[PDB]
Design an enzyme around this catalytic site. Structure first.
Site, PDB file in Angstrom:
ATOM      1  N   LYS A   1       0.785  -1.247   0.000  1.00 42.03           N
ATOM      2  CA  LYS A   1       0.000   0.000   0.000  1.00 42.03           C
ATOM      3  C   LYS A   1       0.829   1.316   0.000  1.00 42.03           C
ATOM      4  O   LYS A   1       0.477   2.264  -0.693  1.00 42.03           O
ATOM      5  CB  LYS A   1      -1.005  -0.026   1.148  1.00 42.03           C
ATOM      6  CG  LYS A   1      -2.086  -1.124   0.967  1.00 42.03           C
ATOM      7  CD  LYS A   1      -2.932  -1.263   2.228  1.00 42.03           C
ATOM      8  CE  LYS A   1      -4.080  -2.224   1.979  1.00 42.03           C
ATOM      9  NZ  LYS A   1      -4.890  -2.477   3.209  1.00 42.03           N
TER      10      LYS A   1
ATOM     11  N   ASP B   1      -9.745   2.350   2.289  1.00 40.12           N
ATOM     12  CA  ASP B   1      -9.601   1.753   3.588  1.00 40.12           C
ATOM     13  C   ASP B   1     -10.115   2.728   4.724  1.00 40.12           C
ATOM     14  O   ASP B   1     -10.803   2.322   5.679  1.00 40.12           O
ATOM     15  CB  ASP B   1      -8.105   1.428   3.823  1.00 40.12           C
ATOM     16  CG  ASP B   1      -7.682   0.111   3.245  1.00 40.12           C
ATOM     17  OD1 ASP B   1      -8.571  -0.763   3.069  1.00 40.12           O
ATOM     18  OD2 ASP B   1      -6.427  -0.074   3.023  1.00 40.12           O
TER      19      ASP B   1
HETATM   20  O1  LIG Z   1      -7.707  -8.978   1.199  1.00 39.87           O
HETATM   21  C1  LIG Z   1      -8.029  -8.134   0.318  1.00 39.87           C
HETATM   22  O2  LIG Z   1      -8.365  -8.429  -0.832  1.00 39.87           O
HETATM   23  C2  LIG Z   1      -7.976  -6.623   0.623  1.00 39.87           C
HETATM   24  C3  LIG Z   1      -7.567  -6.196   1.876  1.00 39.87           C
HETATM   25  C4  LIG Z   1      -7.467  -4.715   2.283  1.00 39.87           C
HETATM   26  O3  LIG Z   1      -6.115  -4.508   2.705  1.00 39.87           O
HETATM   27  C5  LIG Z   1      -7.882  -3.727   1.125  1.00 39.87           C
HETATM   28  O4  LIG Z   1      -7.229  -2.457   1.263  1.00 39.87           O
HETATM   29  C6  LIG Z   1      -7.633  -4.294  -0.295  1.00 39.87           C
HETATM   30  O5  LIG Z   1      -8.095  -3.379  -1.274  1.00 39.87           O
HETATM   31  C7  LIG Z   1      -8.384  -5.613  -0.480  1.00 39.87           C
END
Ligand SMILES: O=C(O)C1=C[C@@H](O)[C@@H](O)[C@H](O)C1
Length: 263
Positions: free
Chosen positions: A69, A105
């Site tokens: 991220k 988020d």
């Molecule tokens: O496990 C997942 O697919 C995600 C987890 C989060 O960290 C979110 O920020 C991400 O966009 C999707």
């Protein structure tokens, strides 16, 4: 039939529930959208490059998980919305041939929280998820403390006005947030007795990992501290990401109804 490609980059990644809930929405909304999206998990090697991979695969958008991220924030062409103040991007969209970052988020987490007036929070961790949650809880006027293992992450949290500790503050916290990668190693994010001390005074123990009872949550449960896993947040932030993936034609609340039910 027009086809657009999507995915989620992470490492690890095979356990993600994004492809399920996003593909359900692409199917449901294909008529409004005038294209069919198809959404895939993408194991990105640590040493690869998120932007290079995005372009190489020809995606119209992607989500971004751990440990990517912050990197996504650094490599995007343009950053829009609350992402600017989160220092983290979880949502990528190809707009006018530019790689644009968003962060869903922050507001996903906000929407997951039933109780509106917690007074303070302790956040464990220094990744992109921790950053977005600090950004978001500060905006709501909580006192936010942050505890992590090293001095990495510091300048971000300090500029946000977070109290960064290098040892566990001896203070009661309303919200205790596990935003480490520890639940993945099947570990606690902190010393057990230290965690106990927080849990005994806390009001909610909040873990980002979704669907499963982490050691963090199982300790809270054993102490009779109220706890919440990442499942409502995952759904809210997915729905907000979908709204971006749709070019803001499908409102996140429409997506959220489909995603929640399929989940
Ligand atoms: O496990 C997942 O697919 C995600 C987890 C989060 O960290 C979110 O920020 C991400 O966009 C999707």
């Amino acid at each position: 039939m027009k086809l657009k490609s999507f995915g989620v980059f992470g490492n690890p990644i095979k356990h993600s529930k994004s492809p399920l809930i996003h593909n359900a929405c692409f199917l449901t909304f294909q008529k409004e959208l005038r294209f069919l999206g198809h959404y895939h998990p993408i194991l990105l090697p640590l040493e690869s490059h998120i932007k290079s991979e995005f372009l190489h695969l020809g995606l119209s958008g992607a989500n971004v998980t751990l440990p990517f991220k912050e990197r996504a924030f650094q490599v995007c062409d343009k950053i829009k919305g609350i992402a600017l103040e989160c220092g983290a991007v979880n949502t990528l969209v190809l707009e006018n041939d530019e790689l644009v970052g968003y962060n869903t988020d922050a507001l996903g987490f906000y929407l997951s929280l039933k109780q509106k007036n917690y007074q303070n929070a302790l956040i464990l961790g220094a990744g992109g998820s921790a950053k977005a949650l600090a950004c978001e809880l500060k905006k709501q006027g909580l006192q936010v403390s942050v505890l992590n293992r090293s001095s990495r992450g510091l300048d971000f949290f300090q500029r946000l006005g977070c109290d960064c500790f290098m040892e566990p503050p001896k203070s009661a916290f309303d919200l205790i947030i596990n935003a480490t990668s520890a639940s993945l190693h099947n570990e606690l994010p902190l010393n057990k007795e230290v965690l106990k001390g927080y849990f005994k005074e806390g009001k909610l123990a909040y873990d980002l990992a979704a669907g499963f009872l982490t050691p963090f949550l199982s300790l809270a449960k054993e102490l009779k501290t109220p706890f919440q896993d990442g499942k409502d947040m995952l759904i809210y932030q997915a729905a907000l990401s979908f709204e971006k993936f749709s070019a803001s034609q499908i409102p996140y609340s429409k997506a959220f109804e489909v995603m929640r039910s399929v989940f």
